Write a protein that binds this ligand. Sequence first.
Ligand SMILES: *[C@@H]1O[C@H](CO)[C@@H](O[C@@H]2O[C@H](CO)[C@@H](O[C@@H]3O[C@H](CO)[C@@H](O)[C@H](O)[C@@H]3O)[C@H](O)[C@H]2NC(C)=O)[C@H](O)[C@H]1NC(C)=O
Ligand code: A1BLT
Ligand code: A1BLT
Ligand SMILES: *[C@@H]1O[C@H](CO)[C@@H](O[C@@H]2O[C@H](CO)[C@@H](O)[C@H](O)[C@H]2NC(C)=O)[C@H](O)[C@H]1NC(C)=O
Ligand SMILES: *[C@@H]1O[C@H](CO)[C@@H](O[C@@H]2O[C@H](CO)[C@@H](O)[C@H](O)[C@H]2NC(C)=O)[C@H](O)[C@H]1NC(C)=O
Ligand SMILES: *[C@@H]1O[C@H](CO)[C@@H](O[C@@H]2O[C@H](CO)[C@@H](O)[C@H](O)[C@H]2NC(C)=O)[C@H](O)[C@H]1NC(C)=O
Ligand code: NAG
Ligand code: NAG
Ligand code: NAG
Ligand code: NAG
Ligand code: NAG
Ligand code: NAG
Ligand code: NAG
Ligand code: NAG
Ligand code: NAG
Ligand code: NAG
Ligand code: NAG
Ligand code: NAG
Ligand code: NAG
Ligand code: NAG
Ligand code: CL
Ligand code: CL
Lengths: 768, 768
Amino acid sequence: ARWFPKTLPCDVTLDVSKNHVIVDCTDKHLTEIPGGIPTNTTNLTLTINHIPDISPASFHRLVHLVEIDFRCNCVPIRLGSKSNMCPRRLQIKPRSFSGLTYLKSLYLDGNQLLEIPQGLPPSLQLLSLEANNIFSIRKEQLTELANIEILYLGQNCYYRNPCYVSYSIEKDAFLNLTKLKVLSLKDNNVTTVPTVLPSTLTELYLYNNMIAEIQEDDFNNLNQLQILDLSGNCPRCYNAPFPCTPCKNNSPLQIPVNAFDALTELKVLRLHSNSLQHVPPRWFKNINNLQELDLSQNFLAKEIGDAKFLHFLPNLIQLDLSFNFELQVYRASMNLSQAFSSLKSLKILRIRGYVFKELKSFQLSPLHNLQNLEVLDLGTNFIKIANLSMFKQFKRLKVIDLSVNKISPLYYFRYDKYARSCSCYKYGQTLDLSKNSIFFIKSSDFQHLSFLKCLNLSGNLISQTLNGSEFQPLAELRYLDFSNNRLDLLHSTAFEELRKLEVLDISSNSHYFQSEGITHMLNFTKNLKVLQKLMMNDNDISSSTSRTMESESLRTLEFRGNHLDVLWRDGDNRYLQLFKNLLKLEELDISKNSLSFLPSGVFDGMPPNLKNLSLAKNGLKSFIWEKLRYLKNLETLDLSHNQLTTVPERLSNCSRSLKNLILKNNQIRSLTKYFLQDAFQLRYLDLSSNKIQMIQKTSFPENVLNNLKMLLLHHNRFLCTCDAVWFVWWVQHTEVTIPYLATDVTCVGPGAHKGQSVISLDLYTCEL
Amino acid sequence: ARWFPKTLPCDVTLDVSKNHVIVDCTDKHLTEIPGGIPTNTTNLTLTINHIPDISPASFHRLVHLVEIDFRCNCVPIRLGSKSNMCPRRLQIKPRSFSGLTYLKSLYLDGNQLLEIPQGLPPSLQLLSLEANNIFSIRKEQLTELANIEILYLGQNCYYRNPCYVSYSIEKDAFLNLTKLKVLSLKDNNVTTVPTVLPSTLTELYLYNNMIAEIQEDDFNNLNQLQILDLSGNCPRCYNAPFPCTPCKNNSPLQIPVNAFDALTELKVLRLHSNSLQHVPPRWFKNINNLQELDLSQNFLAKEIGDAKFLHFLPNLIQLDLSFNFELQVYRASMNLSQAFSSLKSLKILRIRGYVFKELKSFQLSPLHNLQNLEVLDLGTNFIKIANLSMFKQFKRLKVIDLSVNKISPLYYFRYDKYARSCSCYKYGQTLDLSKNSIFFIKSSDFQHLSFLKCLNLSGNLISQTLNGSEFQPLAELRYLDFSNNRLDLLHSTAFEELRKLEVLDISSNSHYFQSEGITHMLNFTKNLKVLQKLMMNDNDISSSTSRTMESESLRTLEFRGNHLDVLWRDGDNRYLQLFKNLLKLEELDISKNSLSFLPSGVFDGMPPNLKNLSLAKNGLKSFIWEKLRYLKNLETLDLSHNQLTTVPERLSNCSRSLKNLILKNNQIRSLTKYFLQDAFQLRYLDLSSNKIQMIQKTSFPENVLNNLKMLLLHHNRFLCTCDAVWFVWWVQHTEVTIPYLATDVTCVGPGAHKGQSVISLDLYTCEL
Ligand SMILES: *[C@@H]1O[C@H](CO)[C@@H](O[C@@H]2O[C@H](CO)[C@@H](O[C@@H]3O[C@H](CO)[C@@H](O)[C@H](O)[C@@H]3O)[C@H](O)[C@H]2NC(C)=O)[C@H](O)[C@H]1NC(C)=O
Ligand SMILES: CCC[C@@H](CCO)Nc1nc(N)nc2c3ccccc3n(Cc3cc(CN[C@H]4CCOC4)ccc3OC)c12
Ligand SMILES: CCC[C@@H](CCO)Nc1nc(N)nc2c3ccccc3n(Cc3cc(CN[C@H]4CCOC4)ccc3OC)c12
Ligand SMILES: *[C@@H]1O[C@H](CO)[C@@H](O[C@@H]2O[C@H](CO)[C@@H](O)[C@H](O)[C@H]2NC(C)=O)[C@H](O)[C@H]1NC(C)=O
Ligand SMILES: *[C@@H]1O[C@H](CO)[C@@H](O[C@@H]2O[C@H](CO)[C@@H](O)[C@H](O)[C@H]2NC(C)=O)[C@H](O)[C@H]1NC(C)=O
Ligand SMILES: *[C@@H]1O[C@H](CO)[C@@H](O[C@@H]2O[C@H](CO)[C@@H](O)[C@H](O)[C@H]2NC(C)=O)[C@H](O)[C@H]1NC(C)=O
Ligand SMILES: *[C@@H]1O[C@H](CO)[C@@H](O)[C@H](O)[C@H]1NC(C)=O
Ligand SMILES: *[C@@H]1O[C@H](CO)[C@@H](O)[C@H](O)[C@H]1NC(C)=O
Ligand SMILES: *[C@@H]1O[C@H](CO)[C@@H](O)[C@H](O)[C@H]1NC(C)=O
Ligand SMILES: *[C@@H]1O[C@H](CO)[C@@H](O)[C@H](O)[C@H]1NC(C)=O
Ligand SMILES: *[C@@H]1O[C@H](CO)[C@@H](O)[C@H](O)[C@H]1NC(C)=O
Ligand SMILES: *[C@@H]1O[C@H](CO)[C@@H](O)[C@H](O)[C@H]1NC(C)=O
Ligand SMILES: *[C@@H]1O[C@H](CO)[C@@H](O)[C@H](O)[C@H]1NC(C)=O
Ligand SMILES: *[C@@H]1O[C@H](CO)[C@@H](O)[C@H](O)[C@H]1NC(C)=O
Ligand SMILES: *[C@@H]1O[C@H](CO)[C@@H](O)[C@H](O)[C@H]1NC(C)=O
Ligand SMILES: *[C@@H]1O[C@H](CO)[C@@H](O)[C@H](O)[C@H]1NC(C)=O
Ligand SMILES: *[C@@H]1O[C@H](CO)[C@@H](O)[C@H](O)[C@H]1NC(C)=O
Ligand SMILES: *[C@@H]1O[C@H](CO)[C@@H](O)[C@H](O)[C@H]1NC(C)=O
Ligand SMILES: *[C@@H]1O[C@H](CO)[C@@H](O)[C@H](O)[C@H]1NC(C)=O
Ligand SMILES: *[C@@H]1O[C@H](CO)[C@@H](O)[C@H](O)[C@H]1NC(C)=O
Ligand SMILES: [Cl-]
Ligand SMILES: [Cl-]
């Protein structure tokens, strides 16, 4: 019961520990900075709005501002929306920030600014101007930035935001920025490394530019540099999903052998997409502490067989040599140099896109004595032959990725993977054979791999009847992903040999369930004694030879995308207890099952400890709410995206346990006279995207509403007459979390109030 | 134009040739028979309504009625809707039909009637009472039906509508119906064949009942019977998707060897699901003209190897022996008796569910000299081995169906396939290998099958790179369905060996298009010189090594369910001419491509003779209508299911050629002041399911409206104030076809008029 309503259209959060007062106006369709922002405000965000200008009046009384995030108010035409394009660039009038003597961070990204904003305070430490039209850096313009530490100037001249000229940087422009630790000139059409840079730099990003050559003294003084990224300079353009111009004559980024000599503190070096053909060992003579090295998207296929530079990298943790194939050569085998054995500290090795026919156990011998190896990733290689038992010498590894290959009996290709916008590994040893050509499996295929905890066979061609003899060696397996295959449940003994299996995914195995007259045994769960979660989604199951699935251990069953409307056809009582004998089942998802109505017997036939039930996306035109009494342990009920028109006359007389009721996206036009009356256990209600016009005090008593952790009411049809005087008042003074209060809890009428937010409504005329 | 607006909520059609005045009120949410039904009404339909009763007042002035279809006004609870269930059964008061001396057909199905309606006219020829609660037929109740010819009484006692007792029929109940040609007692829980039946019967349906035995004289006088159906009497219940009780001891329907002796005119005999183990030749001794014989769902696996009864069936056109497998036996081969060679007139032979491992050429030798054979269907048999070249001896056949099998290098199971409710074969010789386990193809697999005109490999495991050497023998192929496979377009020479190919379906081959960095050649079309239609739907295509698809012959390209939003990413002009060089393309479907906006260059890059363009289901939030000038041959533009808010200022200025414009399911709230001014080519406009409130005279000129073949306006937000005086008058007096005028062209306001149809609106108060 607030004494003064919050009318501001922004989320205000108070952080007493750090003396901070955060005001978040992200995406609030604002044409001006809202009035009445708290005076003690420290963090102000106005991202994704259409405020045309900033002036001294903008932050006149907000003298305690430490951060102003004013991003994407005039986002460039090719990056922003087309339905609501920006007419004119952001206008920053003089002395707009000079008064803010406490300002530490200022983001003015995506505003089509032509020049670096002047008159900034001396307390500024972070300045961000990405996605603007600033493509000429002059020493005089950066004079004001004396105490700056982080400076982002990238994305000011690239294919999604062209400047039509080369990027210009004056000589020694950043040299007097004596506190500059991070500098980013990425995606800018830069032709040379700007010099001289301040020696205090720790991170330098110059990727996706027109730098054809590095001079031997471009980084002669950066003795504190930790991260250096020179990627996408002379790019490898084969199959680039963005406009890509390589250097003439297919030449690489020319780097002198002594260019990195002063970088004794370098930890990360990224040379991705530089068309490199050789990696000279001399580069790493003085770089002893190098931890991460990205050499993906180059022409280093032959170099992988020699790789003498690896002898100078004993502290390297991550090595990426992906997509280095020779454009027209399908190699017979992978040639890994014996130098890979000198990478004592290596944890992650990725060599996707090498492209070779057969993997043999000996080819991986340089990796045998790398005690800290955790990930070996050989995905996207078109490997047709590989004895899976070879991985018995890699029991220590956490993940062995052979995804996207041909074995049988967006990351490397995106332009900027760090572009700013406005799983079973936890179980243990994982062998990923997903998206491969395995059509038949037998126990011998998994010999010597008893240690595996997860096996992902998702997306293979497995059209087979499993009888409990295909995975006999996998005695420790806890997770099997068998999705996107053609499983034939002819026998109820399928998967029984995997005695320690906790999670089984057989989703998207619809093939045999689509043809009539075929036997399906869904009672195979009885034999899996420690199974916790079974997913059998999108199988199109409309028939079953067995009438009951049984299990003493299963806690979650996902059965979405099936045809329970056909199994539970009215007049056919045979499958009404299909899930009843899953005695420890707590979560059942039967959404997307075309259940227009739930026959009588579905609720009585549910397992006894059912906590979360989803009936979403079913086209449910009716629901006997009284039947919820059978589900004595129900905590969450999800009836979203259906065609329900009414709520229960008394929710208390339906379920004593129900905590979370989700009714979003239905046709409810009114709540019953005493809906939540005496339903004190309810802690979450969603009635958003319905067609409710009125909500009275009897249907929504305050003794229940105040207990709610959250209440969603947005996108309804609220009629704002004097009869809604209670709803409008309570919404304005409630402490209960109602998301979208000031942006989507709107009046549809009458006349004057059409489109008006209920939070800003003044019904004083109703009381005179 | 019309002087008197049509206010009746039913479709009135006049057929001057056959002199009928048809009034169709199907599904019009009527609680009473509407007033003002024309006095000349001959055919009146009131199906799917909630009219609680019929009385003499119902058809008082409609003395010329020839047909009354009053079905499903109180449909049984298990068959009907649950959101709006029927409270009480239909009440027919006395003398309701006695006055209608011209009544020929009366349908009172699905009304929960307890007894046969009495007081019917002597002119009635067809009476239908299916899905009611009439399960006791007495001779006295049928005396009024003296001149009846067709009588449907089925579905009055089965699992979806139980009566809890056996069906009773009095002795000689139908005997005095001396004109009865069709009698149907299907799905009724009947225990014996009713006798004596009138000899004038031509069709008798007694399927899905509890008839355990036929007496030798049950059909002793039906010398004019043409169709006899005794299916589902002692049913085969293995994998029945409905409640199925077989006869005790697994015994069949007992039919004496001489039971069909009097049936010299029998053309169709259906013995589906009768658990038959033998078919005695003696049954067909006196049946010489039998044309159709259904023996599916029996236990005739061993009988198929002997089948001596086939020697008495030389005039049989259709033979069905599907789903006769021995429950626990997977046979090594199919044993077809040599007696099949005596079926001289056979055109269709279906033997699905026989279940056998190998198909050998000599096993089909009884079929070699059957000159009229057109269809051989061996689907759902789990055949693992079959030399496709064996079909060289079946060039005369139209369809060879081997769908749903394991070959590698609802119809038979529904309860009542005739239950009433309230393709490449045209190209020539078709070989259907769909839903099989073929993972690799080579030219030798199609040797000796050069005659094939269609080959359906849909839903196989083909993960391969085609280079133009896999289908070398198929020189006459006009249609290849390759959908639901894993095609790898590494080479642009894919499919080029099929030189006479006119239609190619490579839809749902998304596997290789989903992983990054893989080469895809979409320019393979250039080599196919007579290709007319290419479907490459739902492939998730977001990248392509080739920038242009070329073709001198392609007329239709379906590219829905792909990612043209990524290929045409703003700033990337490389794929804007992807479809430009398809010089003879007339229809392009680029719906479901996530195109929120169309970049500049898409319209200019379209082929020159593009006539039909679909951009439906894209989430298009904006559209530069002026760009339609580039599409000089445009005739149909489909922009349905998008987020467009405005129509062009003057459509005629955007496109001189456009004829059909579909804008259904958008956010259009108003039409521009001169929207259709001078749009002389427009013949079809769809503005339904939008949010339009007002339409003025200037937006809809009479010279353009009178040329429209159809105009859709339903499901809008029409405000019915005095400002809508033009639109309300125009809708009432126009002759233009506007569908759903009395069920969905409604007023949303103001107040009083909420929910009212605009056709029934009286705005006389606007002019005083
Ligand atoms: C087709 O006709 C048969 C009879 O020929 C109907 O079966 C009969 O159904 C009733 C009601 O379900 C059964 O009676 C009940 O039996 C139980 C168990 O003894 C008892 O607790 C009830 O109070 C009641 O007496 C009756 O036994 C049963 N008869 C036979 C021979 O099965 C059948 O329902 C009809 N089919 C349909 C679809 O209506
Ligand atoms: C219309 C399909 C009918 C079903 C019936 C199964 O209950 N068959 C099948 N239903 C499914 N879901 N899959 C398959 C299947 C997959 C591969 C090969 C043949 C296959 N059959 C054929 C079949 C097999 C057997 C196996 N026998 C061995 C078991 C241990 O010792 C003997 C017995 C009777 C059979 O049909 C009569 C079926
Ligand atoms: C990251 C994958 C990159 C692409 C590159 C294609 O330009 N490869 C592939 N792209 C697709 N879409 N599929 C396959 C593929 C399928 C099965 C086996 C290997 C496969 N490769 C591998 C490859 C093959 C060749 C075969 N050449 C013979 C053809 C006739 O004479 C020479 C040449 C270079 C190759 O990569 C270097 C690819
Ligand atoms: C409010 O502004 C301050 C200053 O810009 C933000 O402080 C940064 O917080 C992160 C941790 O989240 C630290 O790693 C940085 O070093 C801090 N920067 C500075 C300059 O102190 C703070 O996160 C902002 N709070 C919100 C909620 O926006
Ligand atoms: C990067 O700079 C180059 C020039 O160094 C820009 O290329 C020029 O673009 C104009 C306008 O299209 C042409 O008239 C010139 O001929 C181009 N010069 C050269 C040498 O190519 C290029 O547009 C810039 N990149 C971006 C994304 O703006
Ligand atoms: C109007 O009623 C007549 C009589 O019930 C219908 O006539 C049937 O027409 C079909 C098709 O021409 C014939 O096969 C039937 O034999 C006719 N039945 C009788 C009893 O004559 C006619 O179809 C009805 N028209 C409509 C549109 O409902
Ligand atoms: C491996 O590749 C190197 C060149 O990179 C070559 O010198 C060497 O002979 C190759 N060895 C094998 C076994 O392929
Ligand atoms: C696979 O490798 C194991 C040894 O790791 C060996 O015992 C087995 O025979 C091999 N199988 C094949 C087919 O090479
Ligand atoms: C298996 O791999 C697929 C991708 O091929 C991935 O979507 C899925 O999440 C993986 N399974 C698990 C359990 O991580
Ligand atoms: C399972 O099938 C394999 C062959 O695929 C066979 O060796 C084994 O005996 C079968 N299991 C049982 C229990 O019959
Ligand atoms: C599944 O049901 C079938 C009968 O329908 C039975 O033979 C089989 O033993 C059942 N499976 C289990 C694990 O109980
Ligand atoms: C679903 O059940 C799990 C426990 O099995 C629980 O943690 C989770 O909160 C439930 N879902 C919801 C939405 O409450
Ligand atoms: C609770 O609901 C049931 C069913 O709707 C009803 O019969 C009963 O009277 C209700 N309880 C009270 C106290 O009204
Ligand atoms: C075919 O089946 C019949 C029985 O139906 C049997 O008499 C005959 O020997 C069988 N012949 C072959 C070749 O299998
Ligand atoms: C398939 O049958 C043809 C004869 O029609 C024969 O020439 C060919 O060798 C057979 N192929 C196989 C694999 O047996
Ligand atoms: C191929 O078979 C599938 C069913 O397996 C069917 O949907 C499709 O229409 C068939 N193709 C043609 C061209 O008829
Ligand atoms: C196509 O593949 C076949 C089988 O591998 C091969 O013999 C043939 O040479 C290939 N075609 C071309 C043009 O290389
Ligand atoms: C398809 O494009 C590639 C280059 O991307 C070219 O080599 C090939 O010849 C093209 N194919 C045709 C049929 O034009
Ligand atoms: C026009 O093309 C559409 C596809 O965009 C097609 O569905 C429609 O039937 C075509 N109509 C005519 C008259 O050609
Ligand atoms: C569009 O309208 C203007 C004004 O009448 C006219 O000058 C222009 O030629 C028109 N364009 C087309 C394509 O009809
Ligand atoms: Cl079993
Ligand atoms: Cl090629």
